[PDB]
Amino acid sequence: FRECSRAFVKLQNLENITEDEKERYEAIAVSIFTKHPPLDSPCEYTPCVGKNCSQQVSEYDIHCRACGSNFSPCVASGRPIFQKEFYQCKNCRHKMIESEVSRLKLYNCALCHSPIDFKRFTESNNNNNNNI
Amino acid sequence: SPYFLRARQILADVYLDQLRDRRNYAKCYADLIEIDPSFDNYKMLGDALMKIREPEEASRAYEKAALIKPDDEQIIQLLGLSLCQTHDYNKALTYYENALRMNPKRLDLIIDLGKLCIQIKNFNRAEEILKPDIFSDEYQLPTYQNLKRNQEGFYLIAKLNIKRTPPGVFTPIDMYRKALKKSIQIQIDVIEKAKQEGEDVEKERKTLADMYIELAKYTNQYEKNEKATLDILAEASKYTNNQDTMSKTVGNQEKILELEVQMYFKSNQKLECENKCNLLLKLNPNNDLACLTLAELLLQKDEYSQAIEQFKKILQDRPNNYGILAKLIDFFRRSFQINEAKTYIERAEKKATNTNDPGLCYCRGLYHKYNRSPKDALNEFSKAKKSSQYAEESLVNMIDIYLNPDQDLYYSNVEEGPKVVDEVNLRACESLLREMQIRASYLRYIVMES
Amino acid sequence: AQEQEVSKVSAPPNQPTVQVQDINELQKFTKINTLPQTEEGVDLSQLMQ
Numbered sequence: 363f364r365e366c367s368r369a370f371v372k373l374q375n376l377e378n379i380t381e382d383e384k385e386r387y388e389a390i391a392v393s394i395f396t397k398h399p400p401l402d403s404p405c406e407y408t409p410c411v412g413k414n415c416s417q418q419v420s421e422y423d424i425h426c427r428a429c430g431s432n433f434s435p436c437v438a439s440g441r442p443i444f445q446k447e448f449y450q451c452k453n454c455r456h457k458m459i460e461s462e463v464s465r466l467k468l469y470n471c472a473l474c475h476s477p478i479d480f481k482r483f484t485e486s487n488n489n490n491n492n493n494i
Numbered sequence: 495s496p497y498f499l500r501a502r503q504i505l506a507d508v509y510l511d512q513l514r515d516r517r518n519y520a521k522c523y524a525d526l527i528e529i530d531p532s533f534d535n536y537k538m539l540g541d542a543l544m545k546i547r548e549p550e551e552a553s554r555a556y557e558k559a560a561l562i563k564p565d566d567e568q569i570i571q572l573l574g575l576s577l578c579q580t581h582d583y584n585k586a587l588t589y590y591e592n593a594l595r596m597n598p599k600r601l602d603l604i605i606d607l608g609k610l611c612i613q614i615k616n617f618n619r620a621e622e623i624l625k626p627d628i629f630s631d632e633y634q635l636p637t638y639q640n641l642k643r644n645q646e647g648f649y650l651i652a653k654l655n656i657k658r659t660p661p662g663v664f665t666p667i668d669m670y671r672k673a674l675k676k677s678i679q680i681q682i683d684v685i686e687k688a689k690q691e692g693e694d695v696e697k698e699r700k701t702l703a704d705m706y707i708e709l710a711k712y713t714n715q716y717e718k719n720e721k722a723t724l725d726i727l728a729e730a731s732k733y734t735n736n737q738d739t740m741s742k743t744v745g746n747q748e749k750i751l752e753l754e755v756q757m758y759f760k761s762n763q764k765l766e767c768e769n770k771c772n773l774l775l776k777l778n779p780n781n782d783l784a785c786l787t788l789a790e791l792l793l794q795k796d797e798y799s800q801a802i803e804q805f806k807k808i809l810q811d812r813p814n815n816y817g818i819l820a821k822l823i824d825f826f827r828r829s830f831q832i833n834e835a836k837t838y839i840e841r842a843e844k845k846a847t848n849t850n851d852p853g854l855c856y857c858r859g860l861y862h863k864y865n866r867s868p869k870d871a872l873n874e875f876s877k878a879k880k881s882s883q884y885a886e887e888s889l890v891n892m893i894d895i896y897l898n899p900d901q902d903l904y905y906s907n908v909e910e911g912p913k914v915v916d917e918v919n920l921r922a923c924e925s926l927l928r929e930m931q932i933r934a935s936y937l938r939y940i941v942m943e944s
Numbered sequence: 945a946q947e948q949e950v951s952k953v954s955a956p957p958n959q960p961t962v963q964v965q966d967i968n969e970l971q972k973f974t975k976i977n978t979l980p981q982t983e984e985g986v987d988l989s990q991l992m993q
C-alpha cells in the first residue's frame with residue numbers, strides 16, 4: 363500500500379483534471395485507505411550488489427537511494443539484476459537472467475527477438491566478463 | 495558569495511529541466527541541509543518535497559524542524575497538512591487532537607481537523623468540533639483574517655449540513671440557506687476589507703460568484719422560485735464583471751449562462767432561450783447544451799412537415815452540428831435509410847478536427863447500435879461517456895445493450911420471459927448504476943436499478 | 945503436393961492472421977479477478993478503463 367499511496371497522491375493532479383474526476387479519485391482513495399490503514403507486507407531484504415554498503419535494499423526498489431547505483435532491468439520478467447548471471451545480445455544489449463530463461467524456455471531475446479542461441483550467448487558474455 | 499544561494503538554485507533548475515532527474519532535484523536541497531543544519535533548511539526541503547509530492551519525507555523533515563523550532567505555528571500547520579496529505583488519517587487525527595488539547599486557540603487547526611474529519615466520513619465529531627469554535631470566535635470582528643476564518647468555518651458547516659442529506663428528499667433545508675447567506679455576507683465584507691488594504695481581490699470575487707452559483711443551484715433544485723433565482727443570477731453576473739474578469743475568466747460566465755439556459759427551457763420561452771443560446775455560441779463554439787436546446791426548439795417549431803429538409807440544410811451549413819445529426823440518425827433509423835446516414839456521418843467526421851469528440855462518438859455509437867452491432871456501439875458509448883452531457887443517455891444505452899442484446903420485448907408471454915446471461919453482465923450493470931447514481935438523474939437511476 | 949506441405953511448414957502470416965485472436969475479455973477477465981472488488985465497497989472500475 364505504500365506504492366498505492368504514492369501512485370494515488372501522484373494521480374490527484376498531474377497537470378490538469380476536471381473537478382468531477384479529481385473528486386472521484388479522492389473518493390476512491392479515501393474509501394481504499396479508510397477500509398484499513400496502509401500496511402507494508404514483509405518481503406526479503408536481499409543484500410545489495412551495486413555497492414559495498416551493508417544497508418540492504420528492498421527487492422522491488424530500483425532507485426538505490428543514498429548510493430546512486432541504479433540496477434539494470436531484465437527484459438525477461440522485470441526483476442532487477444541481483445546476481446552475477448546476466449547477459450545481453452549484440453542487437454539490444456539488455457541484461458537477462460539465466461533462471462528466467464530456463465523457467466520460460468525463451469529461444470529468442472524478449473525485446474528484439476534476436477534469433478541466436480541463448481547458451482552460446484551466455485558463454486560469450488562470460489568470456490567478455492573474463493576479459494574485463 | 496552573496497549570490498551563492500541563487501547560483502545553486504539556478505544550477506538545480508538546469509539540473510531537473512535539462513537532464514530530467516527528480517533525485518538530483520531532491521539532492522540539491524538535501525546537501526543544503528546536510529552541510530549545515532539551520533532554523534529554515536528543513537522547511538525548504540519540506541517545500542521542495544511538496545513540490546515533487548513526496549509527503550512522507552517532507553513530514554519527517556517537518557518533524558525535525560518542529561524538534562528544532564519550539565512552537566513555530568507555521569511548522570505546526572505544515573505538519574498537519576502533510577500528515578493529512580499522506581493518506582494516513584489515524585496519526586493525522588491523533589496529531590490534530592493533541593495540538594487542539596495543547597492550544598485550543600488555533601482556528602486554522604480547527605478548520606484542518608474539521609476538513610480531515612469530513613474526509614474520513616465522521617460527521618458527528620466533525621460537527622461537534624466545528625460548531626463551538628465557530629460560534630465562539632466572534633470577538634475579533636475588525637480583524638480581516640479572523641473574518642476569513644469565520645467565513646471558511648460557516649462554509650464548511652454548510653457543506654457538512656448538505657452532506658448529511660439522504661437522496662430523494664425535496665424539502666428546502668433552511669439552515670443551509672442561512673449559513674450560506676451568512677457566508678456570502680462575510681465574503682462581501684472581506685472583499686471590501688481586501689479592497690481597503692490594496693490587495694488582489696478578484697479571487698475572492700470569483701469564489702463568491704461560485705458560492706452564488708451553488709446557492710442558486712440549491713434553491714432551484716428543490717423549490718421552483720424562478721424570480722428569486724433570476725435575480726440572484728443577475729446579481730452574480732453583475733458581481734463577476736469587475737476589473738479584467740471579462741476576458742481572463744470565462745468558465746464562470748459559461749456556467750451562469752448555462753444555468754440561465756436551463757431556467758429559460760423550464761419556463762418554456764423559445765425566443766429568450768434562443769437568445770441565450772446565441773450568447774453561448776458567441777462565447778463557446780463547442781457547447782453541447784446550446785446545440786441540444788436549439789435542436790429541441792427546432793423540433794418544437796417543425797416536427798414532420800419539412801423538418802428533415804431544414805435539418806439537412808443546417809447540417810450542410812455547419813460542419814459538426816451534433817444534435818441535429820443525432821436527430822437525423824434517429825429519423826433514418828425510423829425510415830430504414832441507414833446508408834445515407836453512414837454517408838452523412840463520414841462527411842461530418844472528415845471535417846471534425848478531433849475524432850474523439852463526445853457528440854461525434856455518441857452519434858457513432860448510436861448508429862452502430864441501430865445497425866445490429868453491439869460491440870463497437872458499446873465501445874463508442876463508453877468512449878463518449880467522458881463528458882458532462884450525453885452521460886445519462888450513453889449509460890442507459892449501455893445498460894440496455896447489456897440486458898437486451900437483440901432489442902426485443904422485455905417479458906415474452908409465449909415462454910419464460912426473463913433472460914438471464916452469466917454473471918459478469920450483472921456486475922457491469924451494477925458498475926454502470928453506480929456511475930449513474932452520481933452522474934445521471936435519480937428517477938432514471940431508480941428505473942435502471944429496478 | 946509438396947507445395948502445400950512446404951507452405952504449411954513455413955506459412956509466414958503476412959497480414960490476414962497476424963494477431964487474430966479476438967474473444968470478449970471485458971467479460972472474461974471480469975470473472976477472473978474482480979470478485980473481491982464487488983464483495984467489498986471498492987470501485988476501481990475507473991482505473992481499469
Ligand SMILES: [Zn+2]
Pocket residue numbers: 410411412413415419426429431
Ligand atoms: Zn546499495
Ligand SMILES: [Zn+2]
Pocket residue numbers: 451453454455456471472473474475476
Ligand atoms: Zn536483444
